[PDB]
From Swiss-Prot, chain A:
<feature type="region of interest" description="Disordered">
    <location>
        <begin position="221"/>
        <end position="243"/>
    </location>
</feature>
<feature type="disulfide bond">
    <location>
        <begin position="93"/>
        <end position="227"/>
    </location>
</feature>
<feature type="glycosylation site" description="N-linked (GlcNAc...) (hybrid) asparagine; by host">
    <location>
        <position position="305"/>
    </location>
</feature>
<feature type="region of interest" description="Receptor-binding domain (RBD)">
    <location>
        <begin position="21"/>
        <end position="243"/>
    </location>
</feature>
<feature type="region of interest" description="Receptor-binding motif; binding to human ACE2">
    <location>
        <begin position="139"/>
        <end position="210"/>
    </location>
</feature>
<feature type="disulfide bond">
    <location>
        <begin position="240"/>
        <end position="292"/>
    </location>
</feature>
<feature type="glycosylation site" description="N-linked (GlcNAc...) (high mannose) asparagine; by host">
    <location>
        <position position="379"/>
    </location>
</feature>
<feature type="glycosylation site" description="N-linked (GlcNAc...) (complex) asparagine; by host">
    <location>
        <position position="318"/>
    </location>
</feature>
<feature type="glycosylation site" description="O-linked (GalNAc) threonine; by host">
    <location>
        <position position="25"/>
    </location>
</feature>
From Swiss-Prot, chain D:
<feature type="glycosylation site" description="N-linked (GlcNAc...) (complex) asparagine; by host">
    <location>
        <position position="156"/>
    </location>
</feature>
<protein>
    <recommendedName>
        <fullName>Spike protein S2'</fullName>
    </recommendedName>
</protein>
<feature type="disulfide bond">
    <location>
        <begin position="90"/>
        <end position="101"/>
    </location>
</feature>
<feature type="glycosylation site" description="N-linked (GlcNAc...) (hybrid) asparagine; by host">
    <location>
        <position position="132"/>
    </location>
</feature>
<feature type="glycosylation site" description="N-linked (GlcNAc...) (complex) asparagine; by host">
    <location>
        <position position="192"/>
    </location>
</feature>
<feature type="coiled-coil region">
    <location>
        <begin position="7"/>
        <end position="51"/>
    </location>
</feature>
<feature type="disulfide bond">
    <location>
        <begin position="140"/>
        <end position="184"/>
    </location>
</feature>
<comment type="function">
    <text>Subunit of the fusion protein that is processed upon entry into the host cell. Mediates fusion of the virion and cellular membranes by functioning as a class I viral fusion protein. Contains a viral fusion peptide that is unmasked after S2 cleavage. This cleavage can occur at the cell membrane by host TMPRSS2 or during endocytosis by host CSTL. In either case, this triggers an extensive and irreversible conformational change that leads to fusion of the viral envelope with the cellular cytoplasmic membrane, releasing viral genomic RNA into the host cell cytoplasm.</text>
</comment>
Length: 414, 210, 420, 198
């Protein structure tokens, strides 16, 4: 209380200070048993990839891997990530991964990111600007280049219009670059739309080949066909706990569920649409997330000038969840209940009031509305006052406030 | 020839339980009370796919058995195939050309197997994630679709990436059916206590629906 | 169509005539006022940061915004008790009803504390209570008074109002019989007290019938709770918005706080969570601002209700269209969810009759005038009446005073003013 | 503690200004909350970003302060309207409005000034010493019903009297203090008594 109120002295009153969330008792982890090794070794040691207009959308699924083998790898000339940081990959779970992979010259590897430009981005592989994934490459002059130039590697140099996100196009038709009506015939302003690198091993880095992978990621409500190397615990129920299901971290009472799911439902969700029921991926157990009990901590006290003693109302709580006294307003610890009723003093809620009195203690009681009085009514009864009084009630009103002014400029900028 | 679509072509929006909520989304849906084309099993033409489709057939001999979808439909490249082989369901993308009138006589990058009888389906393409939904029931009518509600249930997502521009229905031979197109529409929904939708509104239908 | 302003009425003004009413009604007109909204509180740290310790630290960049948000909703929450108390706890003692209903006809039974039921609610209050229709860091505090304590106060107010007139607001509940109470309210609006006794059986039956008609109005009319249901709906709507706002991105990669923390390095998550924090914070300041304004709006209605209590129940107001329409007699409070209902009881004249009038009369050639009321004739003889009921009295010494010779006055007439 | 309303207004201004000051120590995601640090460690093109955070934060605190001041001023203005009304009703006159000019039947009021406020001393009547009596809403005398021109008919058993409604002051029922309202028949609970004539 003293710290909440930022002072060493506090008057008689009832005060918010914290919320006692009943603490998360253990940390559950649950994932599908999909723990066979992902083919990332075959991807990042591939014999070759396709020419970049025909980039390989290699779907990776039904597996797990330690990505630290990969992000610490001495193989890569380029390793970049988007919507994710690599340290987290071993905690992650994914609906799918797609190793969008190809060969290009080094001067075009810089085109491989969101918002980037040039014919490889624009005519061979265009990212979503709303991406989630990673861009990875290694210089391959050691294997893809050959003396006399390796002409087996290609790119689209021309197209009528730019690619949409993840668009792919194998068309060989002659690009009409201008007013010449090509009609399938090459010539002035009529060009074949592809171009060949001809990779020589003596080329400088701008023309040296690179093997490239873009890991496009899919994360959605369906079961995780991919995860990092992290291992499950057993399942737990009916206790306030920390947990993870399928990569989703959470905390709550993992209650047994009256919430009947449809078969395809991996999750249930709140009015907030935050996750509110969960399935064990292995055990197929529907768990209903009741909140961990979250009692607002209203500290009840006389003033520190008067006494050092205290009582505590955990709002809305049942006392078993934590002398003690349950109320409709929550669990009142440390006050002493009284059968009598007086005028209120510290108001508490649902008719409860408290005060500190003499052997001294904080009493808590249902308030009295006042003295109770049967009037002498009838069809013929009267009273008339024989004597009276003057009186002088004092009424206090605020009428103005201290006229502030601020120069917003000197206040903000000094 | 026509029937009215009524409130047909509604399907489950996502893999999420929600408690009795009046939830909402914008998605590809069959436009409420649109008139939709009626076909007689005398005919199974090639039809556009456009954005996405509702198909339903009213049967008892169950003459309908599948669909073929893609670019060419003559298998000169990959083309999606679906056939409910009685107790089972074939799916393929084959370049093998089956019979040029494509009915069961009573290399593929993917290949797989799982009037009262109304059988109903919905199909849509989303970034090459091709999603399909379903239902089937007895009904008391041939000529028109039933006017009562039900949200169709997911069969598959096919992330196969085919440019499905055309499709055609497939038969078993020696019935009537209906087809129409989905549109991007704002919608309202009615969940229940068992995570299950029980009614919906096409917000784009009229000013009251807005 | 162009709306009607009502049907038109050219009132037949003249320098020589008056309409004076022969019969009336003791109609009862309902009124309804809000007094409190639901006592919400938000732990702004629980709402914003959802038990991410990372966020819970980061929020200190923004300093004392989280304390002043708790403080503002605390200030509102406190003055809900104040509103509820200051409308109802105006009476100092819990008066309780006599065992026998010897009121002289007036069938109070429907609005009294029900003497059989375990809770002191009235019959009409039960129709009201029966008419009317959170997990994520939001909370609802209880009201200070219970719903039954509220019924004890409305019961007590009503019991003082029955047993003792208005006196129990300003003194002891000086008892006086209820038929003598009505005679005072009549004596207020220029209706001489004899008129009650001269019509008492009828007057009581009008009241009894009017009460019954209010029961049927509230029983039938699903729209009747409009003001009180509105206050509930606005606050529910505000919280439902404030809950759905958790799901807006505010330009972060996700609106799920834990999701960011489950994907990102702290160096990124700082920037992303700066968006969510600023967003949720701006939304919470928006809600608190709208609650402060709406709490001032409810506090106007609470002061208005506290004044309707202090006047219409605890006296007879002189204020036209303050205590219901027309020449007000008395009023009864009834409790409700979040608010209060008044039954206002009012004398309304109904059967008009037209007459000749002169502002004065000459008997000695000196001008006589009504000591109270109007001078009137039908054409057969001259009379005086009190203002709002046609009681023709012979113009005499006994009901007039003289103000010099007649010469200045216009529309004055000769008449034979009598002396017993 | 009776002056709690005024002290509360002073505390609310003091609390608000102290809050508005203390927010200058908060960094709002800047590397320091002291503006001169950025200007003495960083150089323009980089410095601007941190300065813009501080501007944004300091500004939003000021926007909040001004908004709370408008609302708080509206409350004080409603209170000034109440005060102006009690000044006019209670000091420049007497109020018919029960308890408005202080609790009880109002007589009169005196204003006194105080910082940021006003106080009224409301002079009010309260009745103090009941006697019970029996009562009837009319008398009948000489076959005529009678009613009080002012007051109530009461008996101590031994006698009947008219008296004023809010202070016991009995007088004998007379043809002068009564008015006649016709024959005797209609009234409920009426009683036989003599009415005197002078």
């Amino acid at each position: 209380t003293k710290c909440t109120l930022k002072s060493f002295t506090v008057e008689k009153g009832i005060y918010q200070t914290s919320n006692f969330r009943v603490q998360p008792t253990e940390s559950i982890v649950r994932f599908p048993n999909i723990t066979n090794l992902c083919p990332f070794g075959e991807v990042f040691n591939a014999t070759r990839f396709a020419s970049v207009y025909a980039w390989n959308r290699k779907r990776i699924s039904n597996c797990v891997a330690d990505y630290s083998v990969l992000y610490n790898s001495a193989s890569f000339s380029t390793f970049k990530c988007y919507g994710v940081s690599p340290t987290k990959l071993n905690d992650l779970c994914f609906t799918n991964v797609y190793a969008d992979s190809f060969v290009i010259r080094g001067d075009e590897v810089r085109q491989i990111a969101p918002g980037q430009t040039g014919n490889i981005a624009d005519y061979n592989y265009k990212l979503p600007d709303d991406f989630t994934g990673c861009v990875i490459a290694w210089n391959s002059n050691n294997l893809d280049s050959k003396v006399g130039g390796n002409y087996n590697y290609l790119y689209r140099l021309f197209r009528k219009s730019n690619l949409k996100p993840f668009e792919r196009d194998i068309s060989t038709e002659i690009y009409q670059a201008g007013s010449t009506p090509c009609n399938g015939v090459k010539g002035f302003n009529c060009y074949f739309p592809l171009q060949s690198y001809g990779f020589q091993p003596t080329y400088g880095v701008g023309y040296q080949p690179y093997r490239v992978v873009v890991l496009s990621f899919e994360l959605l409500h369906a079961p995780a066909t991919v995860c990092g190397p992290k291992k499950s615990t057993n399942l737990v129920k009916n206790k306030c706990v920390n947990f993870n299901f399928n990569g989703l971290t959470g905390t709550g009472v993992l209650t047994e569920s009256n919430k009947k799911f449809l078969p395809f439902q991996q999750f249930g969700r709140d009015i907030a649409d935050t996750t509110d029921a969960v399935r064990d991926p292995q055990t197929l157990e529907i768990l209903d997330i009741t909140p961990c009990s979250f009692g607002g901590v209203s500290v009840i006290t006389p003033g520190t000038n008067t006494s050092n003693q205290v009582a505590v109302l955990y709002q809305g709580v049942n006392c078993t969840e934590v002398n003690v006294f349950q109320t409709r307003a929550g669990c009142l610890i440390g006050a002493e209940h009284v059968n009598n009723s007086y005028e209120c003093d510290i108001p508490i809620g649902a008719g409860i009031c408290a005060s500190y009195q003499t052997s001294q203690s904080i009493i808590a009681y249902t308030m009295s509305l006042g003295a109770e009085n049967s009037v002498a009514y009838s069809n013929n009864s009267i009273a008339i006052p024989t004597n009276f009084t003057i009186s002088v009630t004092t009424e206090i009103l605020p009428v103005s406030m201290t006229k502030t002014s601020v120069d917003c400029t000197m206040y903000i900028c000094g | 020839a026509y029937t009215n679509s009524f409130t047909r072509g509604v399907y489950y929006p996502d893999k999420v339980f929600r408690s009795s909520v009046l939830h909402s989304t914008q998605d590809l849906f069959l436009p409420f009370f649109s008139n939709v084309t009626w076909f007689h099993a005398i005919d199974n033409p090639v039809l556009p796919f456009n954005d996405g489709v509702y198909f339903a057939s009213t049967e008892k001999s169950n003459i309908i058995r599948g669909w073929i979808f893609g670019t060419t439909l003559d298998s000169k490249t990959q083309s999606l195939l679906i056939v409910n082989n009685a107790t089972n369901v074939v799916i393929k993308v084959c370049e093998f050309q089956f019979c040029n009138d494509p009915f069961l006589g009573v290399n593929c990058t993917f290949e797989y197997v799982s009037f009262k009888n109304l059988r109903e389906f919905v199909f849509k393409n989303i970034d090459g994630y091709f999603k399909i939904y379903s239902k089937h029931t007895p009904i008391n009518l041939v000529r028109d679709l039933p006017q009562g509600f039900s949200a169709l249930e997911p069969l598959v997502d096919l992330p196969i990436g085919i440019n499905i521009t055309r499709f055609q229905t497939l038969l078993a031979l020696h019935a009537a059916y209906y087809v129409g197109y989905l549109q991007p529409r704002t919608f309202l929904l009615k969940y229940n206590e068992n995570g299950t939708i029980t009614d919906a509104v096409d917000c784009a239908l009229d000013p009251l629906s807005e | 169509y162009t709306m009607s302003l009502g049907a038109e009425n050219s009132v037949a003004y003249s320098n020589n005539s008056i309409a004076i009413p022969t019969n009336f009604t003791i109609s009862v007109t309902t009124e309804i006022l809000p007094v409190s909204m639901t006592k919400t509180s938000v732990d702004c740290t629980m709402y914003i940061c959802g038990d991410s310790t990372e966020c819970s630290n980061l929020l200190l960049q923004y300093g004392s915004f989280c304390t002043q948000l708790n403080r503002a909703l605390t200030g509102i929450a406190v003055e809900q008790d104040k509103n509820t108390q200051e409308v109802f706890a105006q009476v100092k003692q819990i008066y309780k009803t006599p065992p026998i209903k010897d009121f002289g006809g007036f069938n109070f039974s429907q609005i009294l504390p029900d003497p059989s039921k375990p809770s002191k609610r009235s019959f009409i209050e039960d129709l009201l209570f029966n008419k009317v229709t959170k997990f994520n860091g939001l909370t609802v505090l209880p009201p200070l008074l219970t719903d039954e304590m509220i019924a004890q106060y409305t019961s007590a107010l009503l019991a003082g109002t029955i047993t003792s007139g208005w006196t129990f607001g300003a003194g002891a509940a000086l008892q006086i019989p209820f038929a003598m109470q009505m005679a005072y309210r009549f004596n207020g609006i220029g209706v001489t007290q004899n008129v009650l006794y001269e019509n008492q059986k009828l007057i009581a039956n009008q009241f009894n019938s009017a009460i019954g008609k209010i029961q049927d109005s509230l029983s039938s009319t699903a729209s009747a709770l409009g003001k009180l249901q509105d206050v509930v709906n606005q606050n529910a709507q505000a919280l439902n918005t404030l809950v759905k706002q958790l799901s807006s991105n505010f330009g972060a990669i996700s609106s799920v706080l834990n999701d960011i923390l489950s994907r990102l390095d702290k160096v990124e998550a700082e920037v992303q969570i700066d968006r969510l924090i600023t967003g949720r914070l701006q939304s919470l300041q928006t809600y608190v601002t709208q609650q402060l304004i709406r709490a001032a709006e409810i506090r106007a209605s609470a002061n208005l209700a506290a004044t309707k209590m202090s006047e219409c129940v605890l006296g007879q107001s002189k204020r036209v269209d303050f205590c219901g329409k027309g020449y007000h007699l008395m009023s009864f409070p009834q409790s409700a969810p979040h608010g209060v209902v008044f039954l206002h009881v009012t004398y309304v004249p109904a059967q008009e009759k037209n007459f000749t009038t002169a502002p004065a009369i000459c008997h000695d050639g000196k001008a006589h005038f009504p000591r109270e009321g109007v001078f009137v004739s039908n054409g057969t003889h001259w009379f005086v009446t009190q203002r709002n009921f046609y009681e023709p009295q012979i113009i005499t010494t006994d009901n007039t005073f003289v103000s010099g010779n007649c010469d200045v006055v216009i529309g004055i007439v000769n008449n034979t003013v009598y002396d017993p």
